[PDB]
Amino acid sequence: HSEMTPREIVSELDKHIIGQDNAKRSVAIALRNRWRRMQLNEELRHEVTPKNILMIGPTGVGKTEIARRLAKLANAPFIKVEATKFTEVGYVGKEVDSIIRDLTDAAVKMVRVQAIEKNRYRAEELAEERILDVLIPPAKNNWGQTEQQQEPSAARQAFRKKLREGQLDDKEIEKQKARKLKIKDAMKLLIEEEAAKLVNPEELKQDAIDAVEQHGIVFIDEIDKICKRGESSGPDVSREGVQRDLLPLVEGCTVSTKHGMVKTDHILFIASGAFQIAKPSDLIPELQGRLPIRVELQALTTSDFERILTEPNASITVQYKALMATEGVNIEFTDSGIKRIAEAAWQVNESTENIGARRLHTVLERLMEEISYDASDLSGQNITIDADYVSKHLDALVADEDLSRFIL
């Protein structure tokens, strides 16, 4: 759909993800390819299949984020399943078709909500005429001057101009309605009332399908957890089983959704792994073939951490500022304050378990616990979170390890 060049995609993706340029390009080539396909002829359009990607990297360094923003950027249906979720189905469990169902139930919970956007002006325009018709019951068969039912727009203009908030005046209108009511309801009863007439069925539910088939993006997390490991055998066939089960989905097939028959032949798949125990070549042959693109993501550094805190649009730091503003408080972060928040997060991840950028949200959040509470009784102030403040609130916690495993 989008006519954005790969470079433009990466750019757009740079507004949310720090670093990981390679994964960005890989995912950007994929998107542009969907465009490249439609520009082709009959034959070549069947033959050309998505170049599914296999993202390789450690926890929380931007794998899902990238895929989430990519999806979001192409207004495409997105689903994220954890591969092992099916490893237990050899005993009982979810079938892999569920992935295409959910990518559908969400490809619908999407086409519907985005039908409330398009149809949010229709009910408050060619539909608010309801209350105005019981306010000034139109002429017994309007005349006809294409400006006659517009002439009132004097008496009529007043009932609309005053309808800029002034209500709670009980009236009635028309299973049409007929029932007597108010306006904080008669009006809202009209909101949905006149709207369900613009949206139809066999096009909405039919399109959600067209979406998944043409723009669906499936993110299979921890694909590496279903590869063969030299510790046993019984569990391996169980793992490799999930691989064979997923095979139809990325090779091309038809799944049954309670909204129709979805064809996976053109859904893009972004698999993901850490590959510390297994290697991508441990994936079954048929799957390695369907995962042509391999891209690695690097571990985040303290500088990446500093940048992640403030650079992204609606970065946690920005959000925080926003939220404190809600309380009428002016929060402000100095460069060294952030340099220290990042520093702390790095420390805990090295001294205990490394959870990537996730650590920032918990560190940042513990740091602010006090202002977050007192914010209401601090309205009209300029609080500055600087290196000092940071140290007073985090040092002790970060310093104590066993405590970090609990509190940070």
Place this chain on the structure above:
Amino acid sequence: TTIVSVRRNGHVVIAGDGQATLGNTVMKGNVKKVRRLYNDKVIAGFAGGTADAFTLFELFERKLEMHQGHLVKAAVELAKDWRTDRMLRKLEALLAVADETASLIITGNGDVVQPENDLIAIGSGGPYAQAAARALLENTELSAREIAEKALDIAGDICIYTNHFHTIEELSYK
């Protein structure tokens, strides 16, 4: 009764008397037989029930609302129902109607009639009015209003069912 309509020098009129008769006696002497319609643009006169009126004139108005001021058509569309609709049928009367465009008679028969010179003279006094109107219209420079008036009097003088109470509705345009 006597309804007279005339048209001369960008002026059209409809004038009527006010006698309602029952047998050989006068029931009322000031019956309004000439009204106005379509946002005082269309004039009309009539012979019949005061209700038949307030029903055939209301409808006529809506028919104009369904045909942008175009007299004739609403008039055609009017006489249309007036001869079809089970109920509307029992209605009896003789509408004389005239706008800046033209003037014409409508009968329960559904007919739409445009008389020789937009000259109309319906009712038992009709012809006497016509005779006098025609005379005046062809031998004097008098005005449409002056005609209908004088003609109406002549009528009421001959017609035992027509009096000298008037109700005129003029119209200017040029």
